[PDB]
Amino acid sequence: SPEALLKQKLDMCSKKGDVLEALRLYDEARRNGVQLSQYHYNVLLYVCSLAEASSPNPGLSRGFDIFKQMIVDKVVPNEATFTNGARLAVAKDDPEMAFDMVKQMKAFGIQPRLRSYGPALFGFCRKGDADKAYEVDAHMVESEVVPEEPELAALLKVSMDTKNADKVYKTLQRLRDLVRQVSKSTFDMIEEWFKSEVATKTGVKKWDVKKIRDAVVSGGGGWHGQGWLGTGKWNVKRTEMDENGVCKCCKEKLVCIDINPVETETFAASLTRLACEREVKANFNQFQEWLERHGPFDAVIDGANMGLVNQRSFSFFQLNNTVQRCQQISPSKRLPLVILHKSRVNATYPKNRALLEKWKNAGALYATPPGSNDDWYWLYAAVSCKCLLVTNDEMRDHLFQLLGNSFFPRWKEKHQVRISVTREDGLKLNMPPPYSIVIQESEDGTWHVPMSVEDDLQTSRQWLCAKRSK
Ligand SMILES: *C1=CC(=O)c2cccc(O)c2C1=O
Ligand SMILES: *C1=CC(=O)c2cccc(O)c2C1=O
Ligand SMILES: O=C1C=CC(=O)c2c(O)cccc21
Ligand SMILES: [Zn+2]
């Protein structure tokens, strides 16, 4: 088959980096009247990405012609298409041509992905072209493609470069809303903003206190969204919050922001849906039915994690110590729900085995079936029982990326208990903080900005306190 032949010869070109043979074989196929499918086009886009930048080489600038033709042909793009299209646009380094690709996708009814907007946005950011960056941003907005931190930080940086205090403000609110805690680089960038001449010079001496007060009630708390307040130089300090969310520097008590229980039942349904896709339906169903018949619970334990975190092998001591300590902080002394592999319940010291059976008899242990991923079980139990989740799982794994970066991090902060162990004292339960670890804007315009960290028990979390000295 002549379509199946072109595949064999194109498969050779990508595994050699042979761009000129692919551009010859593309033209030969058009001579032969051979129609190119998804796979043919994706391989040519990838192969063209290997060319670098005298004037444009015929690998890159031909790559966009192949892209434009693929769209005209109405060959539906898959995820490899968007990726290769993006890395072609990255290697070219022409932001205006990157953005032209996205416009073509829009005109032909194709949803662009986040990585499609990157080369454009980041290109216009490097060149200091704020108006083009903002066009790209508005196009993302209308396409319903949600920016993550890198895109937001570029918009912030370009807004700082063009003295656009209004856009800095709006982008800072978008970081709060979407990201919550900022990477090191963004954090440094926000510090720079607050120390800058433009920030010193933008503000108001007098504003309507009630209009602010109503906005605070309106937004859920911890921000108002009405613009910069106060005047004069900002006092900008790197500081920390104490255990109660009091700023060490200015003594403001940070706010604790509620979760809307409607978002929670939505999240619960999404977990069920995501889990049923990956587990054997009847296994996850069986767990749901068992859970409806048991409880109430004050806490759910990731049994594998409590047995294995900081251990060379499974410590029943550590699991048992953790069960006992959760029971002890339960106002009515409920046993926590231990989720553990059936593999692990069957361990080899008889009194430990009998305790695992007693917890199961007490309605406080569920042995997950062989093949299952425990994570879905302990997630679904904690969410549905509206209780604490005791786990030190870092949650890097692909699974957790499916849960989203808005609701689930907020839920996690309110529900997650982690264990820490010292020589001196043994095992400690680290409880959810009595405040929200998020960018906050106070009623008089004081800002607290949390840096993001891998582990906030290992490393003490840096915050920025930006307060008007007048
Ligand atoms: C916040 C305010 C302040 O005046 C001050 C002074 C000395 C040392 C500090 O850390 C701070 C501070 O964090
Ligand atoms: C926010 C505020 C608060 O006082 C509190 C107290 C106990 C447990 C919590 O999770 C919270 C909270 O999230
Ligand atoms: O779509 C579903 C996946 C798993 C599951 O347990 C389930 C369910 O229990 C009820 C309706 C839908 C689903
Ligand atoms: Zn402060």
Side-chain angles (χ1 to χ4, degrees):
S1 181
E3 293 91 59
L5 175 53
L6 179 68
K7 189 178 166 169
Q8 270 195 283
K9 304 206 79 172
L10 281 174
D11 278 348
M12 187 208 66
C13 290
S14 74
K15 276 80 222 295
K16 286 171 68 185
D18 190 359
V19 178
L20 184 56
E21 183 65 10
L23 297 177
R24 193 193 68 75
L25 287 164
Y26 174 66
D27 295 342
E28 191 203 58
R30 195 153 285 257
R31 270 185 185 179
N32 295 7
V34 176
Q35 182 66 235
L36 294 85
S37 71
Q38 291 190 40
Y39 189 79
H40 296 126
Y41 273 119
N42 288 336
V43 176
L44 269 161
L45 286 172
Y46 169 83
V47 165
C48 287
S49 306
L50 279 66
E52 316 98 53
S54 182
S55 49
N57 293 313
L60 295 173
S61 70
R62 201 83 185 285
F64 297 92
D65 287 312
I66 295 164
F67 191 82
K68 198 203 316 309
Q69 201 63 59
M70 183 187 201
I71 298 304
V72 168
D73 284 24
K74 257 166 276 174
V75 180
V76 303
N78 73 358
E79 302 295 337
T81 312
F82 297 103
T83 312
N84 295 321
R87 64 170 292 165
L88 181 74
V90 173
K92 183 61 154 59
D93 212 64
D94 186 336
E96 198 74 63
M97 285 180 72
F99 190 22
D100 276 327
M101 292 174 61
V102 181
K103 284 145 159 179
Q104 291 169 25
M105 292 176 212
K106 184 68 177 186
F108 285 70
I110 299 156
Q111 179 58 50
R113 313 321 203 217
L114 175 61
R115 65 205 175 273
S116 315
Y117 286 98
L121 184 62
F122 300 132
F124 290 133
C125 158
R126 275 187 296 279
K127 306 215 302 164
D129 191 338
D131 289 348
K132 292 287 191 179
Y134 303 152
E135 277 184 70
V136 174
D137 180 56
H139 205 269
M140 291 181 54
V141 169
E142 211 237 299
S143 310
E144 292 177 347
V145 178
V146 174
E148 301 173 351
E149 189 177 352
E151 292 73 42
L152 291 174
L155 287 164
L156 178 61
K157 186 64 170 64
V158 94
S159 299
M160 292 170 64
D161 292 351
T162 69
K163 322 292 179 159
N164 192 339
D166 182 61
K167 282 282 173 168
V168 172
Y169 185 87
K170 284 187 176 79
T171 303
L172 195 55
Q173 296 292 358
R174 288 174 95 199
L175 288 159
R176 175 194 58 73
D177 180 35
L178 293 163
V179 182
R180 301 187 59 243
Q181 300 133 62
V182 297
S183 78
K184 200 213 184 174
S185 55
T186 300
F187 184 98
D188 290 347
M189 200 194 292
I190 289 163
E191 183 174 54
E192 178 184 301
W193 163 252
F194 279 111
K195 274 173 164 156
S196 81
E197 186 183 0
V198 177
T200 294
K201 294 182 176 165
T202 46
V204 274
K205 207 205 169 173
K206 293 202 171 198
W207 64 86
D208 185 25
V209 170
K210 248 204 178 191
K211 192 200 79 190
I212 298 307
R213 173 89 280 186
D214 286 19
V216 172
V217 168
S218 180
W223 67 292
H224 59 76
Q226 306 314 289
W228 304 113
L229 302 183
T231 60
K233 204 186 191 282
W234 289 94
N235 194 49
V236 187
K237 296 287 178 292
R238 288 158 180 259
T239 188
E240 289 168 353
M241 304 299 124
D242 78 2
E243 69 189 341
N244 302 99
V246 172
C247 175
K248 278 172 193 175
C249 194
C250 71
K251 319 308 177 174
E252 176 148 354
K253 191 183 165 63
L254 291 187
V255 158
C256 196
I257 304 171
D258 292 341
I259 286 176
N260 184 319
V262 182
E263 295 197 81
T264 304
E265 291 312 315
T266 301
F267 189 67
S270 295
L271 271 176
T272 295
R273 178 181 56 79
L274 288 167
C276 278
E277 278 166 15
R278 287 160 190 76
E279 295 291 311
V280 168
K281 265 194 66 153
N283 283 349
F284 201 74
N285 267 107
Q286 184 176 328
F287 176 55
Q288 289 180 306
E289 291 163 351
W290 182 94
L291 204 54
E292 192 276 321
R293 293 175 186 121
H294 294 88
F297 301 114
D298 291 327
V300 169
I301 289 169
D302 176 352
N305 195 256
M306 295 301 95
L308 293 164
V309 72
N310 304 334
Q311 305 292 322
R312 61 173 162 177
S313 64
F314 197 87
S315 173
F316 184 78
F317 166 79
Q318 192 161 261
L319 174 62
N320 187 37
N321 199 352
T322 300
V323 167
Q324 292 171 349
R325 298 295 291 285
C326 292
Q327 181 171 42
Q328 194 64 40
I329 59 161
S330 167
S332 69
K333 306 293 234 308
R334 299 181 178 117
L335 286 166
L337 178 55
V338 182
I339 300 301
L340 199 62
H341 263 308
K342 184 94 81 197
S343 176
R344 299 204 155 287
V345 176
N346 315 329
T348 53
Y349 293 104
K351 288 185 171 179
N352 296 345
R353 183 82 135 76
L355 185 47
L356 291 165
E357 285 302 305
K358 189 203 195 166
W359 291 336
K360 182 189 147 164
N361 269 288
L365 182 149
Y366 188 88
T368 47
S372 67
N373 179 354
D374 283 347
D375 295 5
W376 296 115
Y377 294 70
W378 53 252
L379 281 167
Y380 177 79
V383 164
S384 291
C385 300
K386 293 176 178 60
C387 66
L388 298 169
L389 172 62
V390 183
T391 188
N392 285 36
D393 197 302
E394 289 271 314
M395 302 171 172
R396 305 189 184 284
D397 285 357
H398 281 299
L399 178 160
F400 295 96
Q401 293 162 26
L402 306 164
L403 304 180
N405 199 37
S406 47
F407 179 84
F408 174 63
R410 286 145 53 222
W411 180 90
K412 194 202 296 194
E413 170 177 82
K414 298 205 187 276
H415 294 261
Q416 186 185 15
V417 176
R418 294 163 286 166
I419 57 156
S420 54
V421 186
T422 64
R423 189 197 152 66
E424 292 76 22
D425 303 351
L427 184 144
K428 177 185 170 77
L429 295 183
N430 295 281
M431 306 304 290
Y435 66 101
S436 304
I437 300 178
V438 65
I439 288 163
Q440 300 197 13
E441 169 188 42
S442 79
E443 299 202 32
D444 70 19
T446 304
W447 287 84
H448 299 87
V449 177
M451 209 191 283
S452 185
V453 297
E454 300 290 67
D455 190 68
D456 73 17
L457 300 184
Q458 188 177 229
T459 31
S460 200
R461 191 188 293 271
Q462 295 191 68
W463 290 73
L464 209 55
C465 181
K467 194 183 169 57
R468 297 277 196 174
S469 44
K470 253 71 228 175

